Amino acid sequence: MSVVIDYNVAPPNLSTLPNGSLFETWRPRAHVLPPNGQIGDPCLHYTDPATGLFHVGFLHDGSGISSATTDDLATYQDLNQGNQVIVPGGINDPVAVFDGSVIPNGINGLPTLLYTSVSYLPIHWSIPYTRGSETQSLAVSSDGGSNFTKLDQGPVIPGPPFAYNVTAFRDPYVFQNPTLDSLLHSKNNTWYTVISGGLHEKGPAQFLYRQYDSDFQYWEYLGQWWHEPTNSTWGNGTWAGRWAFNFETGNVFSLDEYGYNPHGQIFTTIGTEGSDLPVVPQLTSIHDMLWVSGTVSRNGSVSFNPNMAGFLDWGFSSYAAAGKVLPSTSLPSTKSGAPDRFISYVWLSGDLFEQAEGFPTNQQNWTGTLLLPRELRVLYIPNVVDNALARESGASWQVVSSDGSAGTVELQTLGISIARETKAALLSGTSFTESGRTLNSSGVVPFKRSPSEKFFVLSAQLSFPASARGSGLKSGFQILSSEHESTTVYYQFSNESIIVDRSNTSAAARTTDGIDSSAEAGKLRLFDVLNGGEQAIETLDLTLVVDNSVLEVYANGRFALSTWVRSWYANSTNISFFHNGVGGVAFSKVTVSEGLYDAWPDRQY
Amino acid sequence: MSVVIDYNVAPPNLSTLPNGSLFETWRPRAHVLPPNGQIGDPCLHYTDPATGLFHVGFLHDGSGISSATTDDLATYQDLNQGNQVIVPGGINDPVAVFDGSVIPNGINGLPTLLYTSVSYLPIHWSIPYTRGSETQSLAVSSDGGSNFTKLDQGPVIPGPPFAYNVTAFRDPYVFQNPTLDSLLHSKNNTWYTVISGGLHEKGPAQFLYRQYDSDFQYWEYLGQWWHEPTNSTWGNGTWAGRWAFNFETGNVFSLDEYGYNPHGQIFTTIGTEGSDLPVVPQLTSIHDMLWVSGTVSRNGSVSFNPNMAGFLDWGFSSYAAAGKVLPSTSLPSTKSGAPDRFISYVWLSGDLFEQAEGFPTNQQNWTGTLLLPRELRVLYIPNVVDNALARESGASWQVVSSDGSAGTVELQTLGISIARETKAALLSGTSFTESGRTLNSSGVVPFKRSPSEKFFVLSAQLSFPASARGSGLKSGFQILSSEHESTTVYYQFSNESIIVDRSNTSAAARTTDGIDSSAEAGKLRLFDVLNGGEQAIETLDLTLVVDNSVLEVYANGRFALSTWVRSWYANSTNISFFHNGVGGVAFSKVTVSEGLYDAWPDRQY
Ligand code: NA
């Protein structure tokens, strides 16, 4: 008949259950992930100029790249029923297909994939590099993006520059930029490529190239346009992790206040591969998902000079972001009236980058997800008090103007928000509000009403008095609660962090190996701000999106922290105010929207 | 019982006979060829420093490189019973293994093969080049040369210099040269590599490299050290074919009067791929086997500047020569007392470079041979009369001194002779002489005694009177004669050529397709010479080596012409003087040595 799962009854050791029995247990409904099995790095994204459809791509089951389309940037349709559009086993890629990116209007006016073709394993920053392990090859889709046919020829970039002893040499990211065109005297709308990795005994780098011929055959090397010393860090390591031992999945793009602008300020997103000392062979212990702002100058060779940096996502398991220009002329953007955007999908690895030993993978029969598509833009924070907090250097913001009369500064940083159409679809459920209140004593205060399922958005504002600064205050919410489980998400002034406490999240973590219960944390500074001539600590504008086991925490349009919340019991759906009693907190009216939506309307599961 | 072959009975259409039935018919006994099947370009040759054994290599059955050893430079022992020491089907060479050469004392003190690893076909100078079709990869033999194990990594030279549109890029030839070391400030005893091919719309070239690291990993590009315009020629095309559309099998070495000398004059041997106009797609119609002398200068980049050139072998089917330094310390050289030598094996394609349609290949069950090993050295011709003949430029010799009193010059050219130990073994049979004579009338004069088998050396000197110059004289020998067949080899003053007339050579050519009967020819100038104060036309010192169907014609230590003489009848063994009646000829005493020897004493067939 069936193997019977009752989520009011206690869990077994989940690894004893049949294959596939936990497929729906923790599965999101509003996120990009394959029909089943494993998802790796997103890549390959492109707007098809002929249709306006936006194509998303991702590594799938360690065997190539799968893809789906969206006409609204909310919901998706599988290509090939989820089967890969390109697989390993060719002449150039006999061992593996690694990440690539797409020139949308390329060879023969077709989407043209430049990707890392792998011929030798293992490959890791910590071990000697095997010559020719990573080349860059071309493929073209003549069938609307369902199949990328490999060009019947060798790699267009057969290895790194002469005698370079690389740590890695992969993840080519194609992009256009008129600032680079001007500085390098390139032909207008030249395609550039960055390749990510580093050099042994020197440190991480992006290797920069430009197309030499219109046919994309030859790629002129323009130097290590950005490189950093081995395991160096932005500032003192507080705000933007470390540059660490190797760069991965380098994206390059340019922004203004509204979205993507070719003439805008230049940003990159990168994964950095970190380690404790001594290094453990073939182990990356820290996967930092960073963004970096910088100016580009020339001095013979072009250079990217960082002026601020932060995390695109503070999640331990968050990594490998791939983003793409989405033009205003796209099908989604035409419906929503958006300007040109840069949409980034962050990867949330399902198994601690394959370190989560004993996780019930055969039972779940899927692993990983992408996070919600995110709009990136230049965010301005006005009316900030010109004090030490605002002026700290080596941080994730910079002063772009000042008012000596008012005593204020305008700050600039990277804006991170849920893509507009996806956010609206997330809120299309049924909405209720919980009354605002102030808390001064220690405890958890149940909401009058909680969602009855584990699919909701929670928004609220938290205001703190001057005395919260530098104190032992902890305030936020307790979610996914019942007598056996709870998860707590809170702001903490002592280290200016948002924390997700997962020690009690999962009753399955007590019976089963490989179900991480570590705390997750990210830094967020709330500055001193001036409005109506009154100086206050900035309001914490918190959004929580819970999609079964996927938690995404957003704050103030500039912060994201995402993780796995693998609660077992059907009843673990209650929400409470939380405050540790140190000082006071005022919670606004809290909005809860329940149900989210189905991001995969043409799948049944 | 057996399929019965009687060589006194007329031949059938040979393509109707059983497979293997003609294995012995035309098979040489004193030449390098595999136990059966096809032989292609020789390559891979090396002296093993540990044993003193000389290793020879060759393409075999279109599927990699086979090898044998010699301890005497006369006789050979198969490695692996003739099975290839390296085969295609690796990561770098999934389609084919092309030519390579060996650094004898390389990685780990082991013979280290650098070779062309092929990933895409077709490849031809006349068609567009597929990117990455030819890379250069490393293999090492740790077992005494029976197996060259591919290094488990990508090619060490993944393609040609950036954006070069090559016609070909293959046949790497490793060599050392202190003249290059001095000119380029290279470390002493640096290994150089030439790679042969050309550039589309520019012409043929050798691409020059030097090792960058002691591990042979990286190869620094030093430019097209020698290149020529498309289908240009030395002089007016008389003496050294054409530079043509592509260079193949470039060897580089340096000589003195005795043999190989690192500080000597620099020479190269090359195949050139020719065509009539218009070009026929994928067809090379002319395969010229050239040698070239030149000086090396620097002008920022190093340059090889030809000062004379000729043919290493004038045979239509002669090509692809591979030679190697053989030191005085080798086993063969220690026995024979030779100094350092450069030994070259020329290939004699068995089937007109796969154009001989209908040849009975399945019946023969082998195809091709290498020619006899040849010593190359600087040859001086003294006491030549200083006239137009001696002074002609764009030819195969140059004036290196002059005596105004005597009216003479010393000439310099490339010396080509049978390697000493092989020549002695060829003459180890039973020897007889035929009396000298003068002929003035037209006809063929039978020898009093002829060899009774088709395995012999014939040596003779032909002296011509002053009036032979510019005349219609034709004199030489008729060989392999009976009532049904004959072959005529003669000198002709009208175009200063040695000719092999094959119109009557083979009774099988009348019954069977693909048995070429075209004439073979090569240029040979006999200069005016002064001895005892008498001016004469130089003596023609002729050697003919007939090894069943393999004919090699040598003259004056500076001329070689080789071809197939596929006589059928057991009785086609008679030899006659030949003279066309135009003027007179004096033949010296003619020596005939019969039997040759077995170059493969440990094979039965
Ligand atoms: Na991370």
Ligand code: NA
């Ligand atoms: Na030839």
